Design a binder for this molecule. Structure first.
Ligand code: UDP
Ligand code: UDP
Ligand code: MG
Ligand code: MG
Lengths: 393, 393
């Protein structure tokens, strides 16, 4: 079996969580890697942005990323990429003609890639599996246009792969999706890498990151974009220091795009530390160093960060949003906050900070909870999904 | 020979000059009709917007318009149509598969259609002839994205068909075009329909349009969009009435999108009359009724309106912009104004209004000048262009 994955506007090779790269990229790369271990051949198609990479990047046996030239390597934001939809498709057409490569199935990611997938699937006469990741309908002409495209894929994809049951309901309510075409594919997290793991490990991580050993740490991990609510953490941390100015608390934000500006405007610069984004092998230390990972998203998911933090034995305080209530077991492995008021977040942070016995237990339980998430699981589900889709054409 | 013309965002069947429909539509329809008379089979592909029309409209022998469904019949402006580029292409792919129809050549119109054309031409292995009509480079992310697409077509189309030599220079300067790929195809105007024509014809037209027989008329014809400068006519007419409040002058604007609001704000409502847009068989009367057609474009062309007015024996006062200096023979069949100051336009209008002998002569000469423009000409040039393109593949 050879699968063409389409990830047009962002590449699985781009460092997550700056820029346009986040959980979807790690989702695409992680599943693809697992599929490739299982002997399924995957090529991930993406728009060429870094020419030093070449056209074909060989990631592992059975796994390639294909960098397709379509418009300039830069100066084209995600909002303008619809203008490249036909060029990118044409780019994929030539590459496959040149390489004489044939696919059994296409799995598209995000509405841009789905529009490409929809054309390719009719041309190649093979099934299209589509994963939305996020959706307009969950108020401008641009969002209206995206919604319309998202509606087209709902109506035309052979299988709509969603990441939770809540997204399935979302598809059915906001897009009138046929429930027979929807399939829940639960996501994973790299649970071997993100792990507690060892009695001295938290403190080893603190030494490595230059964090004081006797202090409480809240971490935010991910893209620094308003929809992710890092401003909520910063504002809540300000409130905490209004209540008790010498609270033993340091914050790490880790993190690519000003939020430092907001932090100094609120007087909390010296207790907040902004870390550059780093590969998973290095992120572990942020998770382990942390007593609490705060994830104040306005929109989401699953919530890969919530899962990775859990896997690493660190309780999460999450917004009651997207996949987060499924990623976090409320009251057992963390807390869920309603809304994004600094006051409500201060409350939730304070209750986990000041109750050691509870917080420690959540962290230990978070590990047990997170082992239910299993990229290799995820791929096993996709593999079946692919086999059925192929069998029914 | 069977040619697929692509006109994605606007249909040759849409009434010119409201909305998104103007000279390009009449260019597409007029050439296609002439090509079809010459035994060349043309299908014009467009986005479906009026379902009462059906999928295939049979216009004449050898001429069809194909309405391709891609996104909703409405609620999608031209700016958001890039989001439909892959759906529209996919739509064309299915239609041709269903109908088992094969093309010798593609002639695309406007950058959207060219992006579709570029993908189709590699797939079908046939030449792409592209006509830009207008160009971004002749300052927002959206215009930057369009420019980039326009640059891609310059680099990839087999023939760049332009409408004047000035556009050729524009292609070469702003887009680094290869001069070997550029071919000037001079446009036409329906010179039999738009004609003087008969000694009592001007006055017959005035009776028909309810215009007083003893008055001077300036007409503006075309889409009421700021880039067309109808505001310039309105402001200039205001200036004329500041200089001499009982000047014998009436204005007809004809015309789809407020400019009536501007007119009342300036005190000139009662001398200005706004006409709904009408088919060519009815527009003739506007041209004949007129003593002067003012065309204060900020961007253009050729300038089909300038040509049609000339053909109908009516002098033109045009902005020195786009194709207008070629469409109008300065000092012989009309005047050219530099810039768009009401004062400069008042001057130019006043000199043609108050000098009958000159104006009458220009009108007579305008006829002789306009017969150099010849849709059947235009098509003869395209026909050769197509034959060469086919011969070189
Ligand atoms: O320094 C960093 C911070 C972020 N991440 C990754 O970025 C992803 C962000 O996931 P999240 O679900 O929060 O982002 P979103 O779903 O909003 O795209 C996670 O997988 C992190 O491992 C990373 O690799 N390095
Ligand atoms: O009531 C009207 C007014 C406009 N036109 C047509 O609209 C076109 C507008 O041409 P122009 O070159 O001025 O528009 P543009 O090039 O800006 O698209 C001309 O062919 C006119 O015949 C028309 O058919 N009916
Ligand atoms: Mg920890
Ligand atoms: Mg006249």
């Amino acid at each position: 079996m050879r699968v063409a994955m389409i990830s047009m506007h962002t590449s699985p090779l781009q460092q997550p969580g700056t820029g346009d790269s986040g959980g979807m990229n790690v989702y695409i790369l992680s599943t693809a890697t697992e599929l490739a271990k299982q002997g399924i051949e995957v090529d991930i198609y993406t728009r060429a942005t870094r020419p030093s990479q070449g056209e074909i990047v060989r990631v592992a046996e059975n796994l390639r990323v294909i960098n397709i030239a379509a418009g300039p390597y830069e100066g084209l934001s995600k909002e303008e990429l619809p203008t490249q939809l036909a060029a990118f498709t044409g780019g994929m057409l030539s590459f496959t003609r040149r390489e004489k490569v044939t696919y059994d199935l296409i799995h598209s990611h995000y509405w841009l890639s789905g529009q490409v997938g929809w054309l390719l699937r009719d041309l190649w006469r093979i099934p299209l599996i589509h994963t939305a990741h996020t959706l307009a309908a969950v108020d401008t002409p641009e969002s209206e246009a995206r919604r319309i495209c998202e509606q087209q894929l709902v109506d035309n994809a052979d299988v709509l792969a969603v990441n939770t049951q809540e997204e399935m309901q979302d598809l059915m309510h906001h897009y009138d999706a046929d429930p027979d075409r929807i399939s829940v594919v639960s996501p994973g997290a790299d649970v071997e890498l993100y792990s507690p793991g060892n009695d001295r490990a938290t403190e080893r991580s603190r030494r490595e990151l230059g964090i004081p050993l006797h202090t409480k740490v809240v971490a935010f991990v991910g893209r620094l974009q308003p929809f992710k609510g890092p401003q909520v953490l910063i504002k809540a941390v300000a409130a905490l220091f209004d209540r008790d100015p010498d609270r033993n608390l340091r914050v790490i934000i880790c993190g690519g795009p000003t939020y430092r500006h907001m932090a100094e405007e609120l007087g909390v610069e010296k207790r907040i530390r902004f870390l550059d984004p780093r590969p998973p092998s290095e992120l572990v230390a942020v998770y382990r160093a942390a007593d609490i990972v705060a994830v104040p998203s306005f929109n989401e998911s699953f919530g890969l960060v919530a899962m990775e933090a859990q896997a690493s034995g660190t309780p999460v305080i999450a917004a009651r949003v997207g996949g987060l209530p499924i990623a976090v077991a409320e009251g057992e492995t963390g807390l869920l906050v309603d809304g994004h008021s600094p006051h409500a977040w201060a409350d939730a942070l304070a209750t986990l900070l000041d109750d050691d016995e509870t917080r420690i237990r959540m962290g230990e339980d978070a590990v047990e909870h997170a082992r239910t998430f299993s990229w290799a699981a995820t791929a096993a589900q996709l593999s079946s999904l692919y086999n059925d889709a192929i069998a029914n054409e």
